Amino acid sequence: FSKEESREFMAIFPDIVRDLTDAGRHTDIPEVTKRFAKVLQYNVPTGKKTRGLSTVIAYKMLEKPENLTPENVRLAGILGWCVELLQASLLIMDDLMDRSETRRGQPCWYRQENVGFLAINDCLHVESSLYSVLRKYFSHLPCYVPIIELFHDVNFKTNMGQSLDALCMKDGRPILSQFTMKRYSSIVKYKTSYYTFQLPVSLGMYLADMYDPEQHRQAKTILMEIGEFDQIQDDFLDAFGDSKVGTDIKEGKCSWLAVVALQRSNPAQRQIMEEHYGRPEPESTQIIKNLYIELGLPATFAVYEEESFNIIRTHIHQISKGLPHDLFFKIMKKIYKR
Amino acid sequence: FSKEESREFMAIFPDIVRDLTDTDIPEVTKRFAKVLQYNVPTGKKTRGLSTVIAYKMLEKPENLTPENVRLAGILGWCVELLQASLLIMDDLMDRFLAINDCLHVESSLYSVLRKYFSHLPCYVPIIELFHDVNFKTNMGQSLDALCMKDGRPILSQFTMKRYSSIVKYKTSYYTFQLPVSLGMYLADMYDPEQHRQAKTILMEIGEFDQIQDDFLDAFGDSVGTDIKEGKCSWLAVVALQRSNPAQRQIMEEHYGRPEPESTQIIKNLYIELGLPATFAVYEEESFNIIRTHIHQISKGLPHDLFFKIMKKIYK
Ligand SMILES: CC(C)=CCC/C(C)=C/COP(=O)(O)OP(=O)(O)O
Ligand SMILES: [Mg+2]
Ligand SMILES: [Mg+2]
Ligand SMILES: [Mg+2]
Ligand SMILES: [Mg+2]
Ligand SMILES: [Mg+2]
């Protein structure tokens, strides 16, 4: 993203914290409002903010140029921060569920002194807070109700994704019979692609007064295809990228690598996965990495990266109902880095 | 609640489960049906039935159609979905329930609202009420947690002002305000002054409800764990107001400890400090104040609704 777009977006965050903690609403409980400021300051504004900024980009590529006022671009930024509020809520909870040590370079929120399982309340609180932001800045606009309904629906779908991911684990141990490409695809769609890709684009559309369910559906078909590649590349680089140190094997994740390894494995190779996948010992991670190398997963990913890129590019050329192709090409180029 | 009211309310629940669960992801949808079935419809449903009663006592008789009473029942089930999300979060904090099931069950009430209410004039006030009540409930949960540090109760925090705030935010908003404000909105009663007048009485009733509960935790016939858990209970707050330095040291030493003998030491102190007699004086004085405020209720609100709520809490 541009320096001007990044700085404009970052300037909004302190106002959202004031709106949620210092707007003279709850003056009888200052210790709680001061704490919630710290919850927001720790968990919301330190990332790359890809999803927030992408909300602004989407809006700027969907709206008529003559409607792109500083005021409307700031509303897009506020919607972006609501996506970053939802994400913060989801990751606070996922870290507690996964018992992770760090997120985005920082100790996980639940590990901070006197949090622990109180992170569940903080998760609910941060997600609830975005609706207060929506009421303040959007209650007077026609997009208000569609935007509220989109956030609640995406929250419900993301929960289905997280729960489906959990149905791949039994008492801390991966259930390898569950590691199918069909279930993988479903996990990625529900758990990540709705909030990562569909939510920013649909928000841009609503702010631009695009309400045609068919325009949203066309955008969704493409964004779910891009989202699937984004998570597959992420899974690949967890094991094969250059040092973030990847822990997906130890964690027993239903990764694209594990799914494709099980498709390709002879019985001896399947037994290695059963014995060593999702185990804590370093030598068990190395055994799984070595099996991924033996099964040719690097070549497999290289072929998938080229084929998927060509299929998505073809599908974007075929988009209709006046959706701008350049937006979908721009999202592709960010994800494929070409 | 009449047999007819209870039975009509219960008949809605299977529809709500089908609405939310019945797809490319049938194994996780089936699981979510079980999450709902196992956690939402069991036990008394006082908050959801209160929403129906509020609507029936607020609406014009001519508008009380079977169809509108069913809409009130659906709003009551939305309150019960929020209750279930809060009981799940409590079960998770105590401990096939998954940690995200509390978030998922809470999110599901907004899908029910969209389904049944999105075309009605009351829709935005209702969704905004749920949004605000959720935020306030979370603030109250956080304030309760600020009364504990490193596993020990912070007795300097145990003030009546903080106790009243905890009860208001954590409990009374969603238990008492939300059912009545829903009944009002469904009956096209939008006037902020009417909601405010109801709120004054409902927060007083909610305060007595929690104080009675706190009293019975220690003094009721069973099994109460407030003392062992170091809870910011009315008994602990008043004990600290009434204690001399020797009595305060007994609280510092024994409040919030795991040993059964420490719970008996604290119960003995509550007896020594006359907490039972203090509760008797409060129950009589609060009953009189609340009855007075109900008789004074204005802005065209019905007395009988608030008397009914008061009578269920005080018996
Ligand atoms: C309803 C909830 C709480 C959803 C969580 C959403 C999410 C993006 C989880 C992280 O995935 P992960 O655990 O597979 O990977 P990591 O934690 O390593 O990012
Ligand atoms: Mg996870
Ligand atoms: Mg995780
Ligand atoms: Mg990853
Ligand atoms: Mg990780
Ligand atoms: Mg109790």
Author numbering:
A (entry chain A): 86 to 328, 333 to 427
B (entry chain B): 86 to 107, 112 to 184, 202 to 328, 334 to 426
Quote the study that presented this structure, word for word.
Here we characterize a metal-dependent, bifunctional isoprenyl diphosphate synthase from the leaf beetle Phaedon cochleariae by structural and functional analyses. Isoprenyl diphosphate synthase in P. cochleariae (PcIDS1, EC 2.5.1.1) produces FPP in the presence of Mg2+, but preferably forms GPP when exposed to the heavy metal ions (HMIs) Co2+ or Mn2+. Inter- and intramolecular cooperative effects in the homodimer strongly depend on the provided metal ions and regulate the biosynthetic flux of terpene precursors to either biological defence or physiological development. Strikingly, a unique chain length determination domain adapts to form geranyl or farnesyl pyrophosphate by altering enzyme symmetry and ligand affinity between both subunits.
Stabilized by cation–π interactions with R427, the F315 side chain positions IPPHAl for nucleophilic attack. V286 and I420 form the bottom of this specificity pocket and act as a molecular ruler, whereas F282 and F315 engage in π-stacking with both allyl groups.
